[PDB]
Amino acid sequence: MERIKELRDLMSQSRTREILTKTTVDHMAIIKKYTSGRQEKNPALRMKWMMAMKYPITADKRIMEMIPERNEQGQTLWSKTNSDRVMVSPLAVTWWNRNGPTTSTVHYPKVYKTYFEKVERLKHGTFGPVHFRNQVKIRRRVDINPGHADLSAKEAQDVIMEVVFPNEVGARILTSESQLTITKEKKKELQDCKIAPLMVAYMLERELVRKTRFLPVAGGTSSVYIEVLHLTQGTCWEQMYTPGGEVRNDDVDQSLIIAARNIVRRATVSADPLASLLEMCHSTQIGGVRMVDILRQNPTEEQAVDICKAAMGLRISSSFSFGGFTFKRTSGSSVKREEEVLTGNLQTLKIRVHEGYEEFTMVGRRATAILRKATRRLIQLIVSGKDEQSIAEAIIVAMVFSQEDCMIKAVRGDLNFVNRANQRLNPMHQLLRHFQKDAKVLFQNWGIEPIDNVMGMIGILPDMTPSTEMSLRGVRVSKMERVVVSIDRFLRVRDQRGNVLLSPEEVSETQGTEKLTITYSSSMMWEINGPESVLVNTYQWIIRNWENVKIQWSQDPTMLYNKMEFEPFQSLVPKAARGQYSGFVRVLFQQMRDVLGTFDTVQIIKLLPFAAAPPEQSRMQFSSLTVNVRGSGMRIVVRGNSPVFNYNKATKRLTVLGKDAGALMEDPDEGTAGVESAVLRGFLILGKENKRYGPALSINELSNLAKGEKANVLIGQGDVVLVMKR
């Protein structure tokens, strides 16, 4: 009523009518941003340049009736300006704050509930000690605002639009049941709201919309730990801290899986993996809560979590998760090998392929299925879902799980298998995400076969239609428990019958990052840390204890090789390599103790962790040794410096992965003659090339020489040198 009379008043005139008629709604935003003047620039200088003035503030003329022109000292609080605006001093703000009409109904706590949640989390937080340590912060994407657990950012924005502006949503429809529930609750909670709809929308954006950022993180990546990242994680220190509220069960499950995988991987290297594993789970906390107390009350299905539960005499599920479905192997076995495959979009990538026939019960909430499969082959899939969308979900999950070459070749479009920061993504998760948006091509390229119509069931066709004649190549539709276990010294989980149910070999090798901070209390607070931390701390321990380590490396080397301090390192060495590597390094060290004058402290420190394995004999000469860091094999070069281990001869400070490890003092028996006895197995390097002895041959070409014979070898980073066979 008011507004229509207002509009008629503006249309009665001439220029406003021409504006209202000759301006579409799309151009209204342009004319709304339309500004006249010299714009503005450097407002900090302006603020310093106007706060010394008398009236730097502009307010509405209504303030005449609220703020007096003068206080009890005759200082002017506002001055009329030659319009509805009025120039005002900050003294007016302070006079309102000390004399203005007060009230018991303020909207600040409700509109800004999330900030008060931060306040409450800090108030009830628990502070532990500060530990100064070599910190390895990795840059990754984390949550700055957690948002609603159910909704995504798009869904949260849709909910906000439907709640605040119901008649302006356009063609959009809320599809999810969580969306509808939250919309109902917010519309119920916001009737008779005296706040403007814009600020209500922004309050709901703070409450519901999830927001992420790339940050350098150590410790937990959950939003309750990211909000206090400045307080808990430093350059050289970790502040033990636990937020005050309630933890999300999802984050607890994730961090438990991470800790269990790290613990099992480190335990496999020990000479008594069972006792080692028990000690670690007894000395581990997850978000402030003891790991054993979590393991006694957490129903998480995972291989390493089940191994941890079995070692402490608990009932396990012997099941895992994949694509939202719970998988339980009923019969069969498998091993895991790395296989390079080419996808439908010409992207080559390695997948962990499981060799061996096996059978699974795949339980979802809206679907269920029996699967039988072999090495990259879907032998049989009997799905029993409720709705055809759930049936399609389960079929897609089973085709991806089968690791069929048809599935790998069905990839079309711009499917990336790397992160935006060029980090490796899980290929199976990427294929699942790709086919869950549209699996038309997968259904076409899967294949069809005629049905014999057994048991009354009916098969489904690539068009998601039921057909009694044909179906997919192995797919059939249908109309529709924690066991006591044992565990031995080597972490093999037998059943009550005596057949192996789990093994450390079934534990996923992916090195992930915890959502809640994992706290380890032992001699080495880094023992169950990530690979970069483990490498840095292993070398830092070696050079920090270099006096006793150096005295022991000569008297009883076997005692030194057997130290626990090298076992977190050995879990990063590839298994098949360990023994060989060890043998190599040990032979080097022995031929180093036999040749007087050849003593290189850097070489011993470099190769000492690799000697921690039972040495297997071999005639191979290694120019490098591999350690698995985040899915990639980093090479430590036997001679000289490298990008994972570089000793600066000038500063004398060893650097491992860019993190300083410390300085090496002056060893009197350092070998300045130039001879090297710990680079090649059975060869003393006597210096640079001598053209007398012929051309340079390869490292792996030296096995047919005889003792008392020099040669020129292209051993190193493009360095030709002169060696001789002992």
Binding site: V25, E168, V169, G170, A171, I173
Partner: protein, 146 residues
């Protein structure tokens, strides 16, 4: 020549509405003249299907006040969806998945209007299948009288 015919065959308001409708999505009325004529015919059928129909103060339809029909066609996408959303939030009728042509307050239902050149069976069936919502009304006219 189609352009000229349209310009002289229909009212200036219907022609202006058609011009707006094809200008919203980047169509020149001088180039695509058959779509110009199709849209003009659609708008004219809708504005005749609507006009001269009211609901009196007791609640039944009388032809001579509360208009019987709400015109959804011939509006901007935003204004059309605003009208549809307001009708849905007031009367509690299911939201159509696509923009309809009219709304019947008396029958309280969205009407999808079609003006076909081909058979009405084919056209009707196609439209119905596409909509797949057994709540939207589908009334198909043709130039033959069927």
């Amino acid at each position: 020549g189609m352009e000229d015919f349209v310009r002289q065959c229909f009212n200036p308001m219907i022609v202006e509405l058609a011009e707006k409708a094809m200008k919203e999505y980047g169509e020149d009325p001088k180039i695509e003249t058959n779509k110009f004529a199709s849209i003009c015919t659609h708008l004219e059928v809708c504005f005749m299907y609507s006009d001269f129909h009211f609901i009196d103060e007791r609640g039944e339809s009388t032809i001579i006040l509360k208009h019987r029909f709400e015109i959804i066609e011939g509006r901007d996408r935003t204004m059309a969806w605003t009208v549809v959303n307001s009708i849905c939030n007031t009367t509690g009728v299911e939201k159509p998945k696509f923009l309809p042509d009219l709304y019947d307050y008396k029958e309280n239902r969205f009407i999808e209007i079609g003006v076909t050149r081909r058979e009405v069976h084919i056209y009707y069936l196609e439209k119905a299948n596409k909509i797949k919502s057994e709540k939207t009304h589908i009334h198909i006219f043709s130039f033959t009288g069927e």
